[PDB]
Structure 1
Amino acid sequence: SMQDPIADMLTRIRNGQAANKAAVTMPSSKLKVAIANVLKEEGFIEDFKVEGDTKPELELTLKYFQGKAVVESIQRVSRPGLRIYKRKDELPKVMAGLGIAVVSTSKGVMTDRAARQAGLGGEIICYVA
């Protein structure tokens, strides 16, 4: 059965923007919108929105620059199979800092660059260049 929403959220983006779609939808959840907004709040996605009452639908707007997908590689690192946590000093880098890593710090889910400024360690959700 399905055993991970985030992975399915990610691939839906990956396979989504793979098909060069405009906007891909999936059932919403806190972590997701929490995740999803950080992209836009970083510039990875155009925009997102939640639709329906008593039913969770997340519709986020992708983006293309010069006919090329704005995101190119997105890898869920912490998996339901094996969990991953990293101390603040040890928060990784993506493409020498060109990429962003989503880390669920205790205070809030946020970018690893902000987490290093906040001096806080967290579960590495996923990677994105």
Structure 2
Amino acid sequence: SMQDTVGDMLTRIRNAQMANKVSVAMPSSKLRKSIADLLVSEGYVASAVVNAEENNKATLSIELKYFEGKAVIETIQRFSRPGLRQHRGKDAIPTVKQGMGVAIVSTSQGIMSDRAARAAGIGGEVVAFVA
């Protein structure tokens, strides 16, 4: 079945932008919202709002962006998959596109960009590369 919730999230975004869809929706979660919130604040997606559904369920809707008719998120790949987790120190965070992209890092201070982790001098789980 589904065993990579984070990978499913990125795959939904990757396919939706490949299909030029206006928005992508999926069942919500705090981990999913935390990554989606970072994508908004990094400037890769327009917005991400959580709608509380019935039976204690929620839907996370993300509004995608396109620049000159091309998807803003050129590549969004998962680095720390469940079959092989990747934790890095403060000096071993791998950069994306020589600092242009974002390596989403899960630190003890929450989900944040790789440039933020180095500024805070903190490592964590490098969960994805988005460029």
Please indicate, yes or no, whether the TM-score normalized by the shorter chain is above 0.5.
yes
Identity of aligned residues (%): 57
Give the distance between the partners of 2:130 and 2:10, measured in 1 at CA: 10
Match 2:105 to one of 85, 103, 106:
103
Match of 2:89 in 1: 87
Alpha-carbon RMSD across the aligned residues, in angstroms, is 0.7
The count of corresponding residues between Structure 1 and Structure 2 is 129
- Runs (4 or more) in structure 1 with deviation over 6 Å come to none
Aligned-partner SS, 1:117: helix
Give the distance between the partners of 1:19 and 1:83, measured in 2 at CA: 30
Q: What TM-score results when the alignment is normalised by the length of structure 1?
A: 0.97
* Superposed displacement of residue 55, structure 1: 1.4
Match of 1:23 in 2: 23
Match 1:118 to one of 91, 103, 120:
120
Q: Deviations over 1:55-99 (max 9, x none)?
A: 110001000011110011011100010000000011111010011
* Superposed displacement of residue 27, structure 1: 0.7
Match of 2:77 in 1: 75
Match of 2:5 in 1: 5
* Superposed displacement of residue 109, structure 1: 1.1
Counterpart residue type for residue 32 of structure 1: R
Q: What TM-score results when the alignment is normalised by the length of structure 2?
A: 0.96
Give the distance between the partners of 1:52 and 1:109, measured in 2 at CA: 22
Aligned-partner SS, 2:36: helix
Q: Deviations over 1:23-49 (max 9, x none)?
A: 011110011000001011010000011
Counterpart residue type for residue 15 of structure 2: N
Give the distance between the partners of 1:84 and 1:78, measured in 2 at CA: 5
* Superposed displacement of residue 52, structure 1: 2.8
